[PDB]
Amino acid sequence: GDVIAILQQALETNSFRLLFQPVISLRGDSHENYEVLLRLLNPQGQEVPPAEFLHAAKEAGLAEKIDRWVILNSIKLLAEHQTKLFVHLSSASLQDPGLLPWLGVALKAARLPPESLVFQISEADATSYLKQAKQLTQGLATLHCQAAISQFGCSLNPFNALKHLTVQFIKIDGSFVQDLNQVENQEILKGLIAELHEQQKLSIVPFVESASVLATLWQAGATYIQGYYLQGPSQAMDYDFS
Ligand SMILES: Nc1nc2c(ncn2[C@@H]2O[C@@H]3COP(=O)(O)O[C@H]4[C@@H](O)[C@H](n5cnc6c(=O)[nH]c(N)nc65)O[C@@H]4COP(=O)(O)O[C@H]3[C@H]2O)c(=O)[nH]1
């Protein structure tokens, strides 16, 4: 239609919804972690997935505003439990010199505890905008936020990026848990996890949709898992982590 007109209006009328998908600790950590996922609410009140609007938003100069809406609301809902939220950043926000100054004031205004937010950057974006990702993640550390790289492991030399960035969590690409009946894929997954741990990064493995995969990941040493098998995205944070 005019997705752009709809987005412009949505940003001014709270016509978005946050969903939450729990991230589960396998090694005894007590935080109640959730990933925040965004849905646009169309004029009929239906949830529309990021695939249908984030691209057009960025091209129309709206991506930073969408990220600020998500972050502002995450900070709020959080404030309302040892909860930690994983929040996505678009590439536009990576490049935005105003993000850090604004985030600093936004955190203080809600009186948010340290280590409450983890900002997620895709591997592709971390690599494409390496200098900006370096600066942003260093700044996040100064503000006592954490950071993560998601969709990890698909670039030619995925570990090189970590030489430059300040990140505590690494969320590997969902492709790595497909076809785990093949021993080659088991070995690839195990090696990836092992190398992340050598680098003292916490591994998160998503797309867990089966007991065999859950068990394989647990034996491979993954520090956290996520997937429909545990719980899909929901409007409420009521997962039983205990
Ligand atoms: N097959 C399968 N799928 C699963 C499973 N568990 C979760 N998913 C879905 O897999 C996608 C994971 O997010 P992402 O791909 O890393 O990447 C995200 C991220 O790049 C972007 N995104 C979503 N929310 C936000 C947001 O708040 N801000 C920004 N900047 N980007 C967002 O949109 C992408 C897609 O998000 P979603 O449509 O919510 O789609 C999500 C999630 O709903 C599973 O076990 N199996």
Please give the helix or strand (H or E) that residue 151 lies within, else none: strand 146-152
Local structure of residue 217 (DSSP, 8 states):
H
**DSSP E strands, the chain:** 16-25, 32-41, 47-48, 83-88, 117-122, 146-152, 169-172, 202-205, 224-225
Measured distance CA(130)–CA(236) in Å, rounded = 35
Please report, to the nearest 10 degrees, the dihedral formed by the alpha carbons of residues 125, 231, 23, 205 taken in order.
-60
Annotated domain spans of the chain = 1-242
Measured distance CA(201)–CA(55) in Å, rounded = 30
Measured distance CA(9)–CA(38) in Å, rounded = 16
Measured distance CA(97)–CA(102) in Å, rounded = 9
Residue 105, both tokens = 């004031």
Local structure of residue 42 (DSSP, 8 states):
-
Point out the ligand 1 atom lying closest to the alpha carbon of residue 18.
27
1-242, which class in CATH? alpha beta
- The pocket around ligand 1, CB under 6 angstroms, is made up of 21, 36-38, 49-51, 54, 67, 70, 88-90, 150-151, 207-209, 227-228, 233
Q: Report the 10 Å Cβ neighbour count for 138.
A: 14
- Beta strands 16-25 and 32-41: pairing type? antiparallel
Sign of CA dihedral 103, 99, 160, 184: positive
Q: Hey, is 230 helix, strand or coil?
A: coil
Measured distance CA(40)–CA(50) in Å, rounded = 7
CA of 54 to the centre of ligand 1 (A): 12
Measured distance CA(100)–CA(139) in Å, rounded = 7
> Method used for this model?
X-ray
Place of tokens 């940003």: 11
Tell me if 209 is assigned to a ligand binding site.
yes
Residue 186, both tokens = 């088991």
Distance of CA 36 to the CA centre of its chain: 7
Please report, to the nearest 10 degrees, the dihedral formed by the alpha carbons of residues 102, 151, 202, 28 taken in order.
100
Q: Hey, is 211 helix, strand or coil?
A: helix
Backbone angles phi, psi at 88, to 5 degrees: -70, 145
Q: Report the 10 Å Cβ neighbour count for 115.
A: 13
Residue among 161, 167, 225, 177 at smallest CA distance from 200: 167
